[PDB]
């Protein structure tokens, strides 16, 4: 493992986390490198399991995909990643800095995270559990895909898909969560659900619903209704994202592009509001 690096060379300084699976830690890599490290608590699930996320960062690499520096291999299981100041894109659209954010700062946000996803689109494989939980967020209001925990190749034959698996249906295309058919295009539903975190500064999508009723009413044809503020046609982009075809919803390519050009080709007459 030419990742593994000695115990000594880091020093945990800030805890920014914690759980029943283990902790995020702020540290120094080093004594020159500030880096996040995420800890196995011994016992809650496999090193094995734990590495899987360091596994996948080995392979893929992008300027808008959390970067992968080292790992402390023998337990307590360490892994170490380019520091995000910010935290998860969730809490930060929740905290106090998330009232000041709007459109224009959202959109470009959204189109960063098309770009890491257009990358992931680029090298055949599907990361499975986008949202804003798993994106990070840096100074400059730069956004990184993480926790490739789930990342993997679509195609790969040697691969035996776990059965009874339970992925969460809000954020999960239902083709992938009721017959595991995991494609790009179920990643794209997820962005579209991520596009509803995005403009409801963080707020759980279907509201006053249960995964049930989720799954039921998606199936039906059910869809989240534009929100307030938010312009039709960015609504537009969420349900092509939503479409019931998974070859019927758009590439990351033409998503990344989409926002990255939003306010001149789409919304050229945009004026701020008092949430959007």
Not at 209 to 228: S, W
Request: aromatic share 10%; glycine share 6%; with cysteine.
């Amino acid at each position: 493992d030419a990742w593994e690096i000695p115990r000594e060379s880091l020093r945990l300084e800030v805890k920014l986390g914690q759980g029943c699976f283990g902790e995020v830690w702020m540290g120094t890599w080093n004594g020159t490198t500030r880096v996040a490290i995420k800890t196995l608590k011994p016992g809650t699930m496999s090193p094995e399991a734990f590495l899987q996320e360091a596994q996948v960062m080995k392979k893929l690499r992008h300027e808008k995909l959390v970067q992968l520096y080292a790992v402390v291999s023998e337990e307590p299981i360490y892994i170490v990643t380019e520091y995000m100041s910010k935290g998860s894109l969730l809490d930060f659209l929740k905290g106090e800095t998330g009232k000041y954010l709007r459109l224009p700062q959202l959109v470009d946000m959204a189109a960063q995270i098309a770009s890491g996803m257009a990358y992931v689109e680029r090298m055949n494989y599907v990361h499975r559990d986008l949202r804003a939980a798993n994106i990070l967020v840096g100074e400059n209001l730069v956004c990184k895909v993480a926790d490739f925990g789930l990342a993997r190749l679509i195609e790969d034959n040697e691969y035996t898909a776990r059965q009874g698996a339970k992925f969460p249906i809000k954020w999960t295309a239902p083709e992938a969560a009721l017959y595991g058919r995991f494609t790009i295009k179920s990643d794209v539903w997820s962005f579209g659900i991520l596009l509803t975190e995005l403009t409801t500064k963080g707020r759980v999508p279907y509201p006053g619903m249960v995964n049930r009723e989720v799954l039921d009413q998606v199936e039906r044809g059910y869809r989240m209704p534009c929100p307030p503020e938010c312009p039709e046609s960015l609504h537009d982009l969420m349900c092509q994202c939503w479409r019931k075809e998974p070859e019927e919803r758009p590439t990351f390519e033409y998503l990344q592009a989409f926002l990255e050009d939003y306010f001149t080709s789409t919304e050229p007459q945009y004026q701020p509001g008092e949430n959007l």
